[PDB]
Amino acid sequence: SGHWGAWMPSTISAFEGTCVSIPCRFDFPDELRPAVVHGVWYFNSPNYPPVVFKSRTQVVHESFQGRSRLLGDLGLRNCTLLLSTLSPELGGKYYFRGDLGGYNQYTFSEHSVLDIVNTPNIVVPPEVVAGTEVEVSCMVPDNCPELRPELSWLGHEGLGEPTVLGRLREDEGTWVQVSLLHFVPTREANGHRLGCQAAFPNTTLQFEGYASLDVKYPPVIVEMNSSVEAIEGSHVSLLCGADSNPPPLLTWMRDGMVLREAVAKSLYLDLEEVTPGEDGVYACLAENAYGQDNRTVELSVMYAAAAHHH
Ligand SMILES: *[C@@H]1O[C@H](CO)[C@@H](O[C@@H]2O[C@H](CO)[C@@H](O[C@@H]3O[C@H](CO[C@H]4O[C@H](CO)[C@@H](O)[C@H](O[C@H]5O[C@H](CO)[C@@H](O)[C@H](O)[C@@H]5O)[C@@H]4O)[C@@H](O)[C@H](O)[C@@H]3O)[C@H](O)[C@H]2NC(C)=O)[C@H](O)[C@H]1NC(C)=O
Ligand SMILES: *[C@@H]1O[C@H](CO)[C@@H](O)[C@H](O)[C@H]1NC(C)=O
Ligand SMILES: *[C@@H]1O[C@H](CO)[C@@H](O)[C@H](O)[C@H]1NC(C)=O
Ligand SMILES: *[C@@H]1O[C@H](CO)[C@@H](O)[C@H](O)[C@H]1NC(C)=O
Ligand SMILES: *[C@H]1O[C@H](CO)[C@@H](O)[C@H](O)[C@@H]1O
């Protein structure tokens, strides 16, 4: 109580070409009773930081000229800063310095890191599995009073209609715009391109961000031979194809014995000089981390080989 100190969000973000208001409050010993309260805003991009604002001499660095103005009264312990027409160069650390005349100048420790962005924020859970309810969100910074972002999805036709949460508060007292997608994805939703757009009315500013859904799903054996009727002594190739994400482990088996095994989309089982001893049921097993599938095929050597003398 009645102490040198400041209060501002450690981090804050805004769209390139827009504005940002950095909420700021500072305090000082009440015993001072200054007739006039002065202040200085400094900028550190990565020992001579450019001056954003300085009430004393009204000096403004060229990078901030006509792009920065102090909001709120310093006499009311309110050092809120507005930065306008933002460009990537303005990204960095901002800190405030109090000046109550005499030797009562004070550079406050707490600062604010401004992040300037050009794409909306799409949040997708690290593991998306088919058959489970999934939430996807588009987040957008909302710290510009003069310009409000309109949020919209791109290529969301198969995922259902969005649910707009609106302006939400995050930590440090900053704001975001959030829109949601709640859906149960099938295997078809794998690779689906998801896009979000942040547009500002009465401007030409339009920001787009895209992401691709990685949908995991169990194997479905889609390629499989029908009942094989082979010629004596011929060559027989059995093919088992499987569709899964991630790619499946394919296993050819007969009589409880693994004939061939490989992590692939398709797996061939080659039988040479086919004899009646090769007759029987062959099984193809497909499995990944999310499920399994299996089919069988009966091999029948029912065609006698013709003699071959020339
Ligand atoms: C330190 O000083 C700073 C600056 O002096 C103070 O910050 C200001 O505080 C005042 C309150 O004293 C605020 O003024 C209020 O603003 C409210 C804003 O809400 C409406 O107005 C907007 C107009 O641009 C409008 O966008 C908004 O949303 C509408 O549009 C959206 C899309 O267009 C849509 O999503 C919405 O649903 C809605 O339709 C609202 O309608 C307003 O409601 C109040 O009546 C009052 O005017 C300033 O905005 C603050 N300025 C800044 C830069 O933050 C700060 O409080 C001081 N600190 C202390 C401790 O005193
Ligand atoms: C946006 O509207 C403001 C007033 O609300 C006006 O000053 C400005 O010129 C407009 N910008 C454009 C590009 O029309
Ligand atoms: C099984 O099917 C694959 C692909 O359709 C084919 O290449 C292969 O020759 C077939 N096997 C037999 C014995 O016909
Ligand atoms: C093959 O799949 C069926 C269900 O599709 C299952 O009941 C059976 O146990 C599976 N067989 C093997 C060997 O995994
Ligand atoms: C600011 O200056 C020093 C900082 O410790 C103290 O005398 C006191 O906190 C004052 O507010």
Numbering used by the authors: 19 to 64, 68 to 331
Q: What is the paper's account of this structure, in its own sentences?
A:
MAG is a type 1 single-pass transmembrane protein expressed on myelinating oligodendrocytes in the CNS and Schwann cells in the PNS23. Myelin-associated glycoprotein (MAG) adhesion and signalling at the myelin–axon interface regulates the formation and maintenance of myelinated axons, thus playing an important role in the development and function of the nervous system. On the basis of the primary sequence its extracellular region is predicted to consist of five Ig domains; an N-terminal V-type Ig domain that is typical for Siglecs and four C2-type Ig domains.
In all three crystal forms MAG has an extended collinear conformation. Only consecutive Ig domains interact with each other via hydrophobic interfaces (buried-surface area ranging from 243 to 690 Å2) and short inter-domain linkers of up to two residues. We do not observe clear electron density for any ligands in the two other crystal forms (lysine-methylated MAG1–5 and MAG1–3). The other glycans are not expected to interfere with dimerization, also not when considering myelin-specific N-linked glycans. We confirmed that MAG dimerizes in solution via the Ig4–Ig5 interface by analysing glycosylated and deglycosylated forms of MAG1–5, MAG1–3 (that lacks the dimerization domains) and the aforementioned mutants in small angle X-ray scattering (SAXS) and AUC experiments. Similar to the SAXS analysis, the MAG1–5 I473E and MAG1–3 SE-AUC data fit best to a single species that agrees with the Mm of a monomer.
